[PDB]
């Protein structure tokens, strides 16, 4: 239909897909593991965004606003989806596998289980593909509610275009399942909830001053 071709969003996900076929289960302190993977993925996250149609035509102060408002849900959606391939664990872009037992021992078990049951398991059960994942992320990226946007209309409108393309792709690739489009969008409220709660854990690890955290991640936790 429009000006927002899903091939190009899919081309975007695939260009940042860390191609990983063997992981090491990491029982050590998972929180540092997850932080380092997140720092690492922040760099790919920007590459990813720049490849989303029209993203880079936005007022620059708007690109910054979107990435800074969307990074935590964007990265959560990323590793939740790679993680459909694990069972009871998540798969970090750094090649580590963190088991839920080990998240529990480190006292972040609850939010960990929320990611398994609300995101990973659902993404696995409905066999969410990479195209839909990219759209969902692009929807999340073009967030017209972010504070300080100057081009609100352009953002809204690019949102609308992503979800029009998503919906049409869905109707065509999965006509067995007329509810699929809704099922996809209805994962966003959980994505939002879980994103807030991870940001709370992070900001708090930062304020306690003990927990390492690298530098792009740190710039993000200072940017919110």
């Amino acid at each position: 239909n429009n000006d927002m071709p899903v091939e190009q969003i899919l081309e975007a996900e695939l260009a940042v897909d860390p191609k990983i076929d063997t992981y090491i289960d990491a029982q050590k302190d998972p929180v540092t593991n997850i932080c380092q993977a997140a720092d690492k993925q922040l760099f790919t996250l920007v590459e990813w965004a720049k490849r989303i149609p029209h993203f880079t035509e936005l007022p620059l102060e708007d690109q910054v606003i979107l990435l800074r408002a969307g990074w935590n849900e964007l990265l959560i959606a990323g590793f939740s989806h790679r993680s459909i391939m694990a069972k009871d664990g998540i798969l970090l872009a750094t090649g580590l596998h963190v088991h839920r037992s080990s998240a529990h021992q480190a006292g972040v078990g609850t939010i960990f289980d929320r990611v398994l049951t609300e995101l990973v398991a659902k993404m696995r059960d409905m066999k969410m593909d990479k195209t839909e994942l990219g759209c969902l992320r692009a929807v999340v990226l073009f967030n017209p509610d972010a504070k300080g946007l100057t081009a609100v209309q352009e953002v809204e409108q690019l949102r609308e275009k992503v979800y029009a393309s998503l919906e049409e792709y869905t109707k065509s690739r999965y006509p067995e399942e007329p509810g699929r489009f809704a099922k996809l969008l209805l994962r966003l409220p959980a994505l939002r909830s879980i994103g807030l709660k991870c940001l709370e854990h992070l900001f708090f690890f930062k304020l306690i001053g003990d927990q390492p955290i690298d530098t792009f991640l740190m710039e993000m936790l200072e940017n919110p």
Partner: peptide
């Protein structure tokens, strides 16, 4: 910041 950096050399 770092984000600006990253977003300009594009």
């Amino acid at each position: 910041k770092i984000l600006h950096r990253l977003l300009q050399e594009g």
